[PDB]
Design a protein around this ligand. Structure first.
Ligand SMILES: O=C(C1CC1)N1CCN(C(=O)[C@H]2CCCO2)CC1
Ligand SMILES: [Cl-]
Ligand SMILES: [Cl-]
Ligand SMILES: [Cl-]
Ligand SMILES: [Cl-]
Ligand SMILES: [Mn+2]
Length: 340
């Protein structure tokens, strides 16, 4: 039977099932006020699927100049054409190679650049903004989005949305690497998975994806979404409550010191965006500091709601296109205030 919602993370994560249900706010606001993330499934069914394909981005925009990041070692690949990224998205024999001769796991940096999404892609902008869930929170002029209503005493988010494009991590060694490292945002965000590319040429890499989800601490109901419904998993997230951010900084200062980094006692390892919490670090956070997080698998069409101030990291299982919009909910406006 169709149902309004369900629970993941053993009851700790709300999953809303109908992205356009006008009564979603009633279930949402109780979880959101407690500083929890929220998942909304089914957004892909509301979109024009032909606007979100890697081959269309390559054909329409392929001649623009961009920088890429090598996810395995953080090396920057400077001033290449954006088609050099898109044409290797799903076909592995077309990817740029490292010196070792392996195909690289790449992230497309800052594209479209700054606030240019709306100017470059007006039809994509319309399709996304008209179909975001919880529209009183997430639309630029929603009644519960304070972004446009705040004085300079508050840090205001840039004009969005922002696109996040990267290949899937592949090997056993890749399990310890992030697509996006641990960081926090002073605004709320909604992050939508609009396309998942399961490759060909090394298509059989499906069993290391299961070990990554399992070792990632994913709950038994999330594991059922693969085996039972054959949905496409895009990315493994870890999110932590805003209230736990200082204890995470204490762990990362102690590990930095153990690894012979030489850091002043006050430096901020979350702001640095230099760490990915692997299975060893996540267990140490729990055992030594008493901190539990949320392990979330984002499938095609899932919208992840990330609370302001919540530390979070992202690990792509397959090649992903994500589109995110920042907003300022009244529940979390304290996180962007410039005093006390
Ligand atoms: O006590 C709180 C509230 C959450 C409980 N905060 C202190 C830290 N904080 C900041 O430093 C601002 C300075 C400009 C942007 O972030 C904001 C949040
Ligand atoms: Cl909060
Ligand atoms: Cl467009
Ligand atoms: Cl709403
Ligand atoms: Cl990063
Ligand atoms: Mn973020």
């Amino acid at each position: 039977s169709m149902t309004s919602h369900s629970w993941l993370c053993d009851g700790r994560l709300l999953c809303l099932h109908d992205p356009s249900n006008k009564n979603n706010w009633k279930i949402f606001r109780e979880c959101w006020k407690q500083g929890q993330p929220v998942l909304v499934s089914g957004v892909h069914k509301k979109l024009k699927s032909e606007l979100w394909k890697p081959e269309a981005f390559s054909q329409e925009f392929g001649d623009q100049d961009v920088d890429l990041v090598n996810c395995r070692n953080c090396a920057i690949i400077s001033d290449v054409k954006v088609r050099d990224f898109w044409d290797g998205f799903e076909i592995i024999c077309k990817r740029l190679r490292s010196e070792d001769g392996q195909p690289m796991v790449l992230k497309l940096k800052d594209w479209p650049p700054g606030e240019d999404f709306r100017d470059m892609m007006p039809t994509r902008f319309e399709d996304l903004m008209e179909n975001l869930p919880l529209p009183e929170y997430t639309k630029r002029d929603g009644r519960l989005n304070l972004a446009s209503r705040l004085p300079s005493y508050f840090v205001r988010p840039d004009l969005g949305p922002k696109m996040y494009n990267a290949y899937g991590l592949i090997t056993a060694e890749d399990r310890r690497v992030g697509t996006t490292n641990l960081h926090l945002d002073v605004s709320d965000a909604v992050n939508v998975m609009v396309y998942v590319g399961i490759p060909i040429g090394e298509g059989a890499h499906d069993e290391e994806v299961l070990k990554t989800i399992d070792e990632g601490d994913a709950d038994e109901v999330t594991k059922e979404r693969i085996h039972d419904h054959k949905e496409k998993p895009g990315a493994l997230w870890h999110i932590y409550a805003a209230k736990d951010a200082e204890k995470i900084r204490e762990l990362l200062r102690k590990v930095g010191e153990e690894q012979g980094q030489e850091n002043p006692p006050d430096h901020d390892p979350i702001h640095d965006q230099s760490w990915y919490l692997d299975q060893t670090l996540r267990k140490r956070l729990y055992e030594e500091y008493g901190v539990q997080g949320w392990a979330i698998v984002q499938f095609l069409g899932d919208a992840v709601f990330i609370p302001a101030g919540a530390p979070h990291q992202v690990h792509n299982l397959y090649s992903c296109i994500k589109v995110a919009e920042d907003f300022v909910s009244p529940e979390h406006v304290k996180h962007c205030f410039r005093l006390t």
